[PDB]
Amino acid sequence: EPAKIYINLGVQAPGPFGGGTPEEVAATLDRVKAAAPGIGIIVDLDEGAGRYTLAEEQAIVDHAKALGAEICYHLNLTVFLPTDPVSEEERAAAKPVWTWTGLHHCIPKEKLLETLLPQKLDELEAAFPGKLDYVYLDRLFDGRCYDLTDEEVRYVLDLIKERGLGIKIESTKYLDTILESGVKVLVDEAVSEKVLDPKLFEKYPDLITVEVLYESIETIERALAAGVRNIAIHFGGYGVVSQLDEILDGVRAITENILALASAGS
């Protein structure tokens, strides 16, 4: 219920553009922690971008977990049928969808939730045993393949509660059902700016963490005024080292922001 501040670091593998090597990610996390040892860190893993090997992700997660950071991971569910096209009532069960790569057939909603989603979570826990804190379910909750019933949503939220995981959401479509099940939620930046506000902050304060892009004192002031109790603050930058420059500047500016707000509320 007391207000808490978190520093959000986006971590993706090197590509022609930005990203960061495992060594750069570890070096950045060490400097960020040294700059604000009293502020939590949330690592947004896997978010023209490169990809990590599994061993690289494991080394990154191990280093961040040892520092005490929380990890948000992209589950990256396969929701399109095993490329082999389908010819029967499976066609009636596989919703045809056109993406940037043409026609695809969604995996039947029953087979995904029953066997494929729990297996993906089991493979996830086997690779990062007890080291993940939030999971991203874009293709499941906000994809063009599935419209989950309220019963199916609670079944999913039960699958990640069993693994001790929260969820990072890109939309408010299932928000109220998310808090009702008592799962931790990480609200992405530009979710409302892309309607739900105060009521849940007063209802479930310790369940909601809102990620905001820092601009000025108004960023922290508006979040506190709206009732947010956990504010994950993302700074500018693209690669991990470029984010480090913005974070180190932002830690100094945010200290002045909180100090000025404290004198006004005194």
Is the residue at 118 inside a domain?
no
Is the residue at 85 inside a domain?
no
Range of the domain at 31: 4-78+129-264
Q: Copy the structure tokens of residue 172.
A: 């408010």
Is the residue at 237 inside a domain?
yes
Give the integer Cα–Cα distance in Å for 41 and 71: 9
Is the residue at 101 inside a domain?
no
- Candidates 173, 182, 171, 242; CA nearest to 208 is 182
Is the residue at 154 inside a domain?
yes
Q: Copy the structure tokens of residue 228.
A: 């947010």
Count up the domains in the chain and report the number: 1
Long-range contacts (CB closer than 8 Å, 24 or more residues apart) made by 104-113: 104/80, 105/80, 105/81, 106/79, 106/80, 106/81, 106/145, 106/146, 107/78, 107/79, 107/80, 107/81, 107/145, 109/145, 109/146, 109/148, 109/152, 112/77, 112/79, 112/140, 112/146, 113/152, 113/155, 113/156
**Structure method:** X-ray
Q: How many CB atoms lie within 10 A of CB 121?
A: 20
- Would you give the distance in Å from CA 128 to the centre of its chain? 16
Is the residue at 93 inside a domain?
no
Give the integer Cα–Cα distance in Å for 145 and 148: 10
HSE-CB at 183 with a 13 A cutoff on CA atoms is 29
Can you give the length of the chain in residues?
A: 266
Give the integer Cα–Cα distance in Å for 128 and 74: 13
Give the integer Cα–Cα distance in Å for 152 and 77: 16
Is the residue at 211 inside a domain?
yes
222: domain CATH number is: 3.20.20.70
- Candidates 67, 91, 31, 88; CA nearest to 249 is 31
Is the residue at 141 inside a domain?
yes
Q: Copy the structure tokens of residue 102.
A: 């043409």
HSE-CB at 126 with a 13 A cutoff on CA atoms is 6
DSSP state of 229: S
Helix intervals (H) in the chain: 22-35, 54-67, 90-93, 109-111, 117-127, 138-141, 150-161, 175-180, 199-203, 217-225, 240-264
